[PDB]
Design an enzyme around this catalytic site. Structure first.
Site, PDB file in Angstrom:
ATOM      1  CG  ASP A  25      18.576  49.844 -55.228  1.00 24.24           C
ATOM      2  OD1 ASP A  25      19.777  50.215 -55.159  1.00 24.24           O
ATOM      3  OD2 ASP A  25      18.140  48.710 -54.931  1.00 24.24           O
ATOM      4  CB  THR A  26      22.359  54.156 -57.363  1.00 22.02           C
ATOM      5  OG1 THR A  26      22.931  53.861 -56.075  1.00 22.02           O
ATOM      6  CG2 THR A  26      21.693  55.509 -57.291  1.00 22.02           C
ATOM      7  N   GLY A  27      21.938  50.845 -56.964  1.00 18.33           N
ATOM      8  CA  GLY A  27      22.587  49.550 -57.038  1.00 18.33           C
ATOM      9  C   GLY A  27      21.808  48.513 -57.826  1.00 18.33           C
TER      10      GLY A  27
HETATM   11  C1  LIG Z   1      23.011  43.801 -54.236  1.00 19.81           C
HETATM   12  C2  LIG Z   1      22.921  44.764 -55.416  1.00 19.81           C
HETATM   13  C3  LIG Z   1      24.097  44.480 -56.382  1.00 19.81           C
HETATM   14  C4  LIG Z   1      21.607  44.571 -56.204  1.00 19.81           C
HETATM   15  N1  LIG Z   1      20.379  44.711 -55.463  1.00 19.81           N
HETATM   16  C5  LIG Z   1      19.908  46.067 -55.251  1.00 19.81           C
HETATM   17  C6  LIG Z   1      20.283  46.523 -53.847  1.00 19.81           C
HETATM   18  O1  LIG Z   1      20.243  47.932 -53.715  1.00 19.81           O
HETATM   19  C7  LIG Z   1      19.420  45.854 -52.778  1.00 19.81           C
HETATM   20  C8  LIG Z   1      17.993  46.376 -52.777  1.00 19.81           C
HETATM   21  C9  LIG Z   1      17.151  45.687 -51.702  1.00 19.81           C
HETATM   22  C10 LIG Z   1      16.741  46.390 -50.582  1.00 19.81           C
HETATM   23  C11 LIG Z   1      16.022  45.755 -49.573  1.00 19.81           C
HETATM   24  C12 LIG Z   1      15.724  44.401 -49.653  1.00 19.81           C
HETATM   25  C13 LIG Z   1      16.106  43.723 -50.806  1.00 19.81           C
HETATM   26  C14 LIG Z   1      16.821  44.346 -51.818  1.00 19.81           C
HETATM   27  N2  LIG Z   1      20.032  46.106 -51.475  1.00 19.81           N
HETATM   28  C15 LIG Z   1      20.602  45.243 -50.634  1.00 19.81           C
HETATM   29  O2  LIG Z   1      20.698  44.039 -50.891  1.00 19.81           O
HETATM   30  O3  LIG Z   1      21.045  45.805 -49.487  1.00 19.81           O
HETATM   31  C16 LIG Z   1      21.458  44.868 -48.476  1.00 19.81           C
HETATM   32  C17 LIG Z   1      22.685  45.459 -47.768  1.00 19.81           C
HETATM   33  O4  LIG Z   1      22.118  46.514 -46.985  1.00 19.81           O
HETATM   34  C18 LIG Z   1      20.878  46.047 -46.475  1.00 19.81           C
HETATM   35  O5  LIG Z   1      19.881  47.078 -46.568  1.00 19.81           O
HETATM   36  C19 LIG Z   1      19.038  46.783 -47.639  1.00 19.81           C
HETATM   37  C20 LIG Z   1      19.001  45.244 -47.706  1.00 19.81           C
HETATM   38  C21 LIG Z   1      20.429  44.893 -47.361  1.00 19.81           C
HETATM   39  S1  LIG Z   1      19.200  43.613 -55.763  1.00 19.81           S
HETATM   40  O6  LIG Z   1      18.011  44.023 -54.976  1.00 19.81           O
HETATM   41  O7  LIG Z   1      19.722  42.267 -55.403  1.00 19.81           O
HETATM   42  C22 LIG Z   1      18.782  43.634 -57.475  1.00 19.81           C
HETATM   43  C23 LIG Z   1      19.409  42.726 -58.310  1.00 19.81           C
HETATM   44  C24 LIG Z   1      19.140  42.681 -59.660  1.00 19.81           C
HETATM   45  C25 LIG Z   1      18.203  43.570 -60.189  1.00 19.81           C
HETATM   46  N3  LIG Z   1      18.012  43.538 -61.513  1.00 19.81           N
HETATM   47  C26 LIG Z   1      17.598  44.513 -59.372  1.00 19.81           C
HETATM   48  C27 LIG Z   1      17.825  44.500 -57.989  1.00 19.81           C
END
Ligand SMILES: CC(C)CN(C[C@@H](O)[C@H](Cc1ccccc1)NC(=O)O[C@H]1CO[C@H]2OCC[C@H]21)S(=O)(=O)c1ccc(N)cc1
Ligand SMILES: [Cl-]
Ligand SMILES: [Cl-]
Ligand code: NA
Lengths: 99, 99
Positions: A25-27
């Site tokens: 997860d690059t995000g």
């Molecule tokens: C929103 C981003 C700035 C950060 N996130 C990582 C992100 O890649 C998450 C990673 C993620 C993935 C699945 C479930 C929860 C979190 N993805 C996500 O929220 O994607 C959403 C939009 O597309 C949908 O598909 C995936 C969930 C939805 S995060 O999970 O909130 C996160 C935040 C802070 C830290 N330190 C580590 C991780």
């Protein structure tokens, strides 16, 4: 490898003697793993994303094997819906985004 | 380009004639943008992130430039902490993860 993004970039990891599936997860700044025990000291932290914040336990100097590549760094543990390999460990295995 | 992950992979996007900053996010299925106006009709969608779910407005076939690359696809709008480019548009610009 070169991983396309038609589907979630899931890989097998080994952490704390356990095999788990995790998302590359690059995000994600940080690596976030579902509840498990890890050895050593930890400190509480909050991490936030879509939907808000969760409380995690932060463990430093944890070794993870990511798709066959070892890396060490901080791992936070808490009620994440998905195991996430974030940038702090993606850098260590030389991962890049290319287009 | 080849983007390393020592810093957040932020890029400039252009949507509705406006430049914005967004995160290239392989952990996101979907592209999620902060509140803005977009043309046409929208559909409801729930997205689940680290701290729970949110409601977003789903707009289809939106023209968006990402780091100089043209995409046309789905953008959802809602209370996200950062604009995120998810795999639905990363695939259109030809992005892969490599290690
Ligand atoms: C929103 C981003 C700035 C950060 N996130 C990582 C992100 O890649 C998450 C990673 C993620 C993935 C699945 C479930 C929860 C979190 N993805 C996500 O929220 O994607 C959403 C939009 O597309 C949908 O598909 C995936 C969930 C939805 S995060 O999970 O909130 C996160 C935040 C802070 C830290 N330190 C580590 C991780
Ligand atoms: Cl670290
Ligand atoms: Cl490097
Ligand atoms: Na430790």
């Amino acid at each position: 490898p070169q991983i396309t993004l038609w589907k979630r970039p899931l890989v097998t990891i080994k952490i704390g003697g356990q095999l788990k599936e995790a998302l590359l997860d690059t995000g994600a700044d940080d690596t976030v793993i579902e509840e498990m025990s890890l050895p050593g000291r930890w400190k509480p932290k909050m991490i936030g994303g879509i939907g808000g914040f969760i409380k995690v336990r932060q463990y430093d100097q944890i070794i993870i094997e990511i798709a066959g590549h070892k890396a060490i760094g901080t791992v936070v543990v808490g009620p994440t819906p998905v195991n996430i390999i974030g940038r702090n460990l993606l850098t260590q295995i030389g991962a890049t985004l290319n287009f």
